[PDB]
Amino acid sequence: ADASDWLNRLAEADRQNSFQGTFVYERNGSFSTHEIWHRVESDGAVRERLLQLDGARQEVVRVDGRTQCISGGLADQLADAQLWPVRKFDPSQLASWYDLRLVGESRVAGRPAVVLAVTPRDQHRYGFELHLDRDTGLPLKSLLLNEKGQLLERFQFTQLNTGAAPAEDQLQAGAECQVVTVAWRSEWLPPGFTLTRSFMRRSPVTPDPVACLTYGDGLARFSVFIEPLHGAMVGDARSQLGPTVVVSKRLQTDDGGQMVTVVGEVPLGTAERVALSIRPEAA
Amino acid sequence: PQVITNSSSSDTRWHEQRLPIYLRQHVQQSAVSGTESALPYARAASL
Ligand SMILES: [Ca+2]
């Protein structure tokens, strides 16, 4: 597949190009602009800085995958333990779950691009329309589409200066950038989703431990939270923020019930099915 | 954000104190997962 070739190209673009650019991220209820400085060092390590341009000065700096510093607003819900990068993007197996196809050509940020359709092979995940830079393979535009082909989010570069390496001054963060197994399993996952992390956190409101499980298929992710109910009769809940769905379902158990919450960039049905499928580990 | 469900001894209030936090956690975590993409960062920043 030439589409496969493009994905492979996209996969390594990060280590083969140094660049600066500005992009927009838009979803229902949010419009924001950001700057990125990305330098490939002489040893091949990637140093990258991301800065929000409108409103508050949110920022992150990463050095060869590790977060060097991150603004408070981006990390209030992360323990330092959580600072691990679980993985490297691997597109090799993505073809199992998505159909990859070149569907045309486009012009984005003043640059010629090829348009790659990433279409789900099932109903359990969302598709993407990716516009890849011809010169470098970097993603100029990314549209997340629902089942009906409706737009859930837009990620798009407005300006991209490639080849050129950002100066050291530009890679430096502002002061706002702060220097930095569970007894539950799912008895159902959509094809290709696999457990990426497992840990315990404390409930935000009570002294109770809350089990956290994260799953991914290479492109999409969802997280599961299991919280004790202590016999409370709490019903279900649902929410959505742009591409991210939230579903909470009561699970009857022999230990007073549990509330199972699933959050992720997957269809509502998927989250719901997963929530209903969470079970405690047995003796 | 806007928590939604109704009338079965399961207050939105109970959910209100939890759901937004869990949502934040998932998005933020995705942001720091090591992916080369700027997109997870963008999503987290949008919060
Ligand atoms: Ca890569």
Numbering used by the authors:
A (entry chain A): 22 to 126, 127A, 128 to 201, 211 to 313
B (entry chain B): 145 to 191
Published text:
AlgU (also known as AlgT or σ22) is the key σECF of P. aeruginosa. MucA and MucB are cognate anti-sigma factors for AlgU activity. In non-mucoid strains, MucB forms a stable complex with MucA that serves as a fine-tune control mechanism that protects MucA from cleavage. MucA and MucB are a pair of negative regulators of the alternative σ22 factor AlgU and are essential for the membrane-spanning signaling in P. aeruginosa.
The MucAperi–MucB was crystallized and the structure was solved by molecular replacement (MR) using the N-terminal domain (NTD: residues 25–208) and C-terminal domain (CTD: residue 209–315) of E. coli RseB as the MucB model. The final structure was refined to 1.9 Å, with Rwork = 0.1729 and Rfree = 0.1929. MucB is composed of an NTD (residues 22–210) and smaller CTD (residues 211–313). The concave sheets from the two domains present an open and accessible cavity to accommodate the periplasmic domain of MucA. In agreement with the RseAperi–RseB interactions, the MucA helix element αI (residues R157–S177) acted as the major binding element during MucA–MucB coupling. First, MucA145–158, corresponding to the structure-unsolved RseA159–168 segment, exhibited an αβ turn conformation and formed antiparallel main-chain hydrogen bonds with the βO of MucB. Second, in contrast with the invisible RseA190–216, MucA181–191 adopted a helical conformation (αII) and bound to MucB-NTD. Comparing RseAperi–RseB and MucAperi–MucB, the MucAperi αII inserted into the inner cavity of the MucB-NTD and a highly conserved proline P112 (corresponding to P112 in RseB) underwent a large dihedral angle transition (φ = −92.1 ψ = −4.6 in MucB compared to φ = −62.3 ψ = 149.8 in RseB) that allowed MucB92–113 to flip to the surface. Therefore, MucA binding initiates the MucB92–113 rearrangement and MucA αII anchoring, leading MucA N-terminal cleavage site to be exposed to the solvent. The MucAperi–MucB complex structure had a polyethylene glycol (PEG) molecule bound, which may be incorporated during crystallization.
